[PDB]
Design a binder for these strands. Structure first.
Length: 1126
DNA sequence: AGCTATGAGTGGCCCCTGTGGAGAGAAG
DNA sequence: GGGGCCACTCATAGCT
RNA sequence: GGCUUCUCUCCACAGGUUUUAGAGCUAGAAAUAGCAAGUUAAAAUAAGGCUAGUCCGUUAUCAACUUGAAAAAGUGGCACCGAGUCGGUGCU
């Protein structure tokens, strides 16, 4: 008798519930066979559980790390390129300089040259640090010096710039000279009054420098500056000029009465040619106005960055840092003098004690600038003559470091100007600098375009670059070796979605002329007209459709019903009155691309030729693909014989956006076998049928449906793994779905492989995507008519229904007590699913037998924590390299153990070197997983183990479960620590009262229900003691933490006077002590309770090891006590 | 008987961070 | 959030 | 309509840490006290891998046993009864 059942699921991001229910809704339990060498042969477990696992990580952290690694590699490579450039001349002056630079990190013992990395003699180091206190002094010296400079210093400056070349958010040359806001603003006002003497404006008394450089948003600054300008509006010509000076994107259409939009932005890569467009429309007289606007914008943005405008130099960043250092020196001297004279007691704390947030901690220690200002402010308040120091502290300019987080805003054009100045002033005395100047400027400025990507020879799963030749790519031949046009096309296309109806085909651009014709004809297909003398509405003929398109759609950008009635039905067909159905007011489709090309090419015969359709489609694709206009220009040059120079320049500056939904093959690529017409052909003319796109693809009399079905991949089960990961959503939900499918498969196996009658599923707040993956596998049988025989029904539900069903019949839930809530949610989901198609539910809730399974995952990821700890005399520090002994060089710490292996061998113990039989868990860190799996015996012997019994080696990943006396379980967190493995269970009687009491004021309900809650909570003061009694008993039984439990009991007795609700929130805080997983610190009322930690793994070395399947229904108990016996 | 080495428990502290530009998608 | 590490004390095995 | 959620991929940037370099002085045998100084740089930023790429290394996948290089396939009885992390009656 094959028993009927169904499968319910509770899918989350951290957990995947599961359940099996029958006709009477009871969850059965089956006697599962227990494999292994223990005395236990079978365990009867309930068909319910809750898989738990670490939350799936989005690749965001991994992607950031990968992009960082590529930046590091390419920056090291820039260093290598500069060292190759310097290499030949370096050997003539100092051959080992580059070697010393690499050996700087090592101690004096490991260095192969003299310990001074720059000069190798201490006299020259003294001279260097006396002459150049920092690097910015050296940069200024090199930028200003005319004398022959030392090559090592030049390399240091150039490498400092190349390694820290600043941001690329501004393209086009930027003048560092213009940095004064107010003077240039008045200059712009004077220029505007010169070009417009008839209507000049006055800006006297307006503090433009303060307002425009204020720390406010661009719109606020624009409003504030205009508010000081009489007669001016923020939307006016001058207001738009100011907005342009602020880096916004003003629209000049209304300012010059232009027909088309005129939007300009200096920060865009295309300001110059768009400005030329505007000048060609309004005249060349306005060129100086926009030039002054650009200069003022440069001045404003620079003043937002640097502060030294008084000093005259062409290195506007070295001077700023030197000035900061001088201010720091002078202010420190003054502060030390004042503290010496007035408050001698705290001199030591401020200037010596590296453990405080004083100047010692700020400079010689680890304290940041904010904390240093916090600590130094009250001391300044308590002393006289500190007005200047208080002012500088208000400006965040007191005692400020050169290398702070404010250097980010520096444009890379400043660094490029400094680089050019250096390479110009040093080229005379060093020929190779002059010869390779362009190469170095390239290396600083060369940036692998965001559309090219990783430069891989196919060996990468992230690479899409297409190559012309096989030369090694260097910045100087990046253009020559790689076709940037093809690279950009691949970059765009690989991301663009493939057609749904045609999976192998590509989607068309939105502004495709063929797509526009398709849409126009498809919309015109269902248009019906009613004229006098006609009994029924009739579809428009193909001739009528073509005439309408030619008369209106090619002549008007937007066509309305009234315009159609007036222009075609009355003028052409001589129908005075016509009724149109299917279109309400106007036609949605528009030949905007066709009208634009009519404006540009101005040859309507060329556009109307179907022979030119391929050329026009290629033009649309070229305009849609490429943002950099050079790519479009080079591609469209294949058509330079078809258009004049002006038309070609017009095509260059036009751009299109968006990608459509359908492919060219689907519309005008495939043809009917019987007729030879495409879908576009049928839409243009279909006779009486007048079938639209949907009708054409769903007509069985046409071969189009057959072509689509054949094109549809009728593939076998192709990579069930990586199939689910193809969905749209976070990787967390993807992992949830995959684990859900695996759990469903294992449940199918457990239930005798008889497929379920129904499947009830919910999803964490996408459900359809989950349902398809399951109903594809569940239903695979076809009847005599090729129809699917649905032996499995897939129903998906909503959390509101389940929550209401729970609260109506009091199947309440608490999310803080224990982890049985996932399984309970799964069971209630199954019950509600059958409801769409009472004691049992309470029994299922009250079962402690639940199979909570922590997914034993071999941890991957960071080998150890990223914070490098100081050098110490300890053995637990991890080397960061092969030659970096952790004692001598510090290094990483806190390894993440991949898994641990039970090693039974003999180890020499004591100074006597006597071999002693041992049995202990050795944790294999992730850094050594490959070495261990390569040859376990050599790895184990390397750690001091001898006569290793390879037969007894067991692989124990993180969260491997052990069973001890009284059923005490400890999950293997790592080699030297455990976790609580037992799931504390409270009966429902405590479960209801806890959430009723803690969420007391927060709940809102009817007055009688609130009174019932009052009575229910007030009576259970006796439960408030039973809860801590159960906690204490479970603690003694498994937690075994008497000190923390005693502190809890004392605190609970101490705070018993406070009201029941206030007690309740703290009582639920207790369960952080008992809940499965790692212990976490919790506080009871005012009292803070330390966390109990299990740093002892000895007790499990004699325990019954348990392996559990993904559901845990199949297990293999191993008794380790029988292993290792002598 | 006394000195040193060494394993278990407990209390405390630590852990990389911030930003910009471009493209393409699901769903609201 | 949680595993790792250290400073500290105490019981116990070992040793003579 | 836009700009939102959320994901991927790419391009860059400013820091942070470690270790070393930036000669600490005086009195005192030393412990130690007084004084002076604190702003920068190099290297590394997951060990490393072979396909030697200006590529790849934290995403995702992974109970145990048998076969298989691997993908992959197979491996374990059910019912009644009562059912705290489980046991009995028939029966396989």
């Amino acid at each position: 008798m094959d028993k009927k059942y169904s499968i319910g699921l509770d899918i989350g991001t951290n957990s995947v519930g599961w359940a099996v229910i029958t006709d009477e809704y009871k969850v059965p339990s089956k006697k599962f066979k227990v494999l292994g060498n223990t005395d236990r042969h079978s365990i009867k477990k309930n068909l319910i559980g809750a898989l738990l696992f670490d939350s799936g990580e989005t690749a965001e952290a991994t992607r950031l790390k990968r992009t960082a690694r590529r930046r590091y590699t390419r920056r090291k490579n820039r260093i290598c390129y500069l060292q190759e450039i310097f290499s030949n001349e370096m050997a003539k002056v100092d051959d080992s300089f580059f070697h010393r630079l690499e050996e700087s990190f090592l101690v004096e013992e490991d260095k192969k040259h003299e310990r001074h990395p720059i000069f190798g003699n201490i006299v020259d180091e003294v001279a260097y640090h006396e002459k150049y206190p920092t690097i910015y002094h050296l940069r200024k010296k090199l930028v200003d010096s005319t004398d022959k400079a030392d090559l090592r210093l030049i390399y240091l400056a150039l490498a400092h710039m190349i390694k820290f070349r600043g941001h690329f958010l501004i393209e086009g040359d930027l003048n560092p000279d213009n940095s004064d806001v107010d003077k240039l603003f008045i200059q712009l006002v004077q220029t505007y009054n010169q070009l417009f003497e008839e209507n000049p404006i006055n800006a006297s008394g307006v503090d433009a420098k303060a307002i425009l450089s204020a720390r406010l948003s661009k719109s606020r600054r624009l409003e504030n500056l205009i508010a000081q300008l009489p007669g001016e509006k923020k939307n006016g010509l001058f207001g738009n000029l100011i907005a342009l000076s602020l880096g916004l994107t003003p629209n000049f259409k209304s300012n010059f009465d232009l027909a088309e939009d005129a939007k300009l932005q200096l920060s865009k890569d295309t300001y110059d040619d768009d400005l030329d467009n505007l000048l060609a429309q309004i005249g060349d007289q306005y060129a100086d106005l926009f030039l002054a606007a650009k200069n003022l914008s440069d001045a404003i943005l620079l003043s937002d960055i640097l502060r030294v405008n008084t000093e005259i130099t062409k290195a506007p960043l070295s001077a700023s840092m030197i000035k900061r250092y001088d201010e720091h020196h002078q202010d420190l001297t003054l502060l030390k003098a004042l503290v010496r004279q007035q408050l001698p007691e705290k001199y030591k704390e401020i200037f010596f004690d590296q453990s405080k947030n004083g100047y010692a901690g700020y400079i010689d220690g680890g304290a940041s600038q904010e904390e240093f200002y916090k600590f130094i402010k009250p001391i300044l308040e308590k002393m006289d003559g500190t007005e200047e120091l208080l002012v500088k502290l208000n400006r965040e300019d007191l005692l400020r470091k050169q290398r702070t987080f404010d250097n980010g805003s520096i444009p890379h054009q400043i660094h490029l100007g400094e680089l050019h100045a250096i390479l110009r002033r040093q080229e005379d005395f060093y020929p190779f600098l002059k010869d390779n100047r362009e190469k170095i400027e390239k290396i600083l400025t060369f940036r692998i375009p965001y559309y090219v990507g990783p430069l891989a020879r196919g060996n990468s799963r992230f690479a899409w670059m297409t190559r012309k030749s096989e030369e090694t790519i260097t910045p100087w031949n990046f253009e020559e070796v790689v076709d940037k046009g093809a690279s950009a096309q691949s970059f765009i296309e690989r991301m663009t979605n493939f057609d749904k109806n045609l999976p192998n085909e590509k989607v068309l651009p939105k502004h495709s002329l063929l797509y526009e014709y398709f849409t126009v004809y498809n919309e015109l297909t269902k248009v019906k007209y009613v004229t006098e003398g006609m009994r029924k509405p009739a579809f428009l003929s193909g001739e009528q459709k073509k005439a309408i398109v030619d008369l209106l759609f090619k002549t008007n950008r937007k066509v309305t019903v009234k315009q159609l009635k007036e222009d075609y039905f009355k003028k052409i067909e001589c129908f005075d009155s016509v009724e149109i159905s299917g279109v309400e007011d106007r036609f949605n489709a528009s030949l905007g691309t066709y009208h634009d090309l009519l404006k540009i090419i101005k040859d309507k015969d060329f556009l109307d030729n179907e022979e030119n359709e391929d050329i026009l489609e290629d033009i649309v694709l070229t305009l849609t693909l490429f943002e950099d206009r050079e790519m479009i220009e080079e591609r469209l040059k294949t058509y330079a014989h078809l258009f004049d120079d002006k038309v070609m320049k017009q095509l260059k500056r036009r751009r299109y956006t968006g990608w459509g939904r359908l492919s060219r093959k689907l519309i005008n690529g495939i043809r009917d076998k019987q007729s030879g017409k495409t879908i576009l052909d049928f839409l243009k003319s279909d006779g009486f049928a007048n079938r639209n796109f949907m009708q054409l693809i769903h007509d069985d009399s046409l071969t189009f449906k057959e072509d689509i079905q054949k094109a549809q991949v009728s593939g076998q089960g192709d990579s069930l793994h990586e199939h689910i990961a193809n969905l749209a959503g976070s990787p967390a939900i993807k992992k949830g779905i995959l684990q859900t499918v695996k759990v469903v498969d294992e449940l199918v196996k457990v239930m005798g492989r008889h497929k379920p009658e129904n499947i009830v599923i919910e999803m964490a707040r996408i459900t359809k995507h989950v349902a398809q993956i399951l109903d594809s596998r569940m239903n695979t049988k076809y009847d005599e008519n090729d129809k699917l025989i649905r032996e499995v029904k897939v129903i998906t539900l909503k959390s509101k229904l389940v929550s209401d069903f729970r609260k109506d019949f009091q199947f309440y839930k608490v999310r803080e007590i224990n982890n049985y809530h996932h399984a309970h949610d799964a069971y209630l989901n199954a019950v509600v699913g059958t409801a769409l198609i009472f004691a049992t539910v309470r029994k299922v809730l009250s079962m402690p037998q639940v199979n909570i399974v922590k997914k034993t995952e071999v941890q991957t990821g960071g080998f150890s924590k990223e914070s490098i700890l100081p050098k110490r005399n300890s053995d637990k520090l991890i080397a960061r390299k092969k030659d970096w002994d952790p004692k001598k060089y510090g290094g990483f710490d806190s390894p993440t153990v991949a898994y641990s292996v039970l090693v039974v061998a003999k180890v020499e113990k004591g100074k006597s070197k006597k071999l002693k039989s041992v049995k202990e868990l050795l944790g294999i860190t992730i850094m050594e997983r490959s070495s261990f799996e390569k040859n376990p015996i050599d790895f184990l012997e390397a750690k001091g183990y001898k006569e290793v019994k390879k037969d007894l080696i067991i692989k124990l990943p993180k969260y491997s479960l052990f069973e001890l006396e009284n059923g005490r379980k400890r999950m293997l967190a790592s080699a030297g620590e455990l976790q609580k493995g037992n799931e504390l269970a409270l009966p429902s009687k405590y479960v209801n009262f806890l959430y009723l009491a803690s969420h007391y004021e927060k709940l809102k309900g009817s007055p009688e229900d609130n009174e019932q809650k009052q009575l229910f909570v007030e009576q259970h003061k006796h439960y408030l003691d039973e809860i801590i009694e159960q906690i204490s008993e479970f603690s003694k039984r498994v937690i075994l933490a008497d000190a923390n439990l005693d502190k809890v009991l004392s605190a609970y007795n101490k705070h018993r006077d406070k009201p029941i609700r206030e007690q309740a929130e703290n009582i639920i805080h207790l369960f952080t002590l008992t809940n499965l997983g790692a212990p976490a610190a919790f506080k009871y009322f005012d009292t803070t309770i330390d966390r109990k930690r299990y740093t002892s793994t000895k007790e499990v070395l004699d325990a019954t090891l348990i392996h559990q399947s993904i559901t845990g229904l199949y297990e293999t108990r191993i008794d380790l006590s029988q292993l290792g016996g002598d």
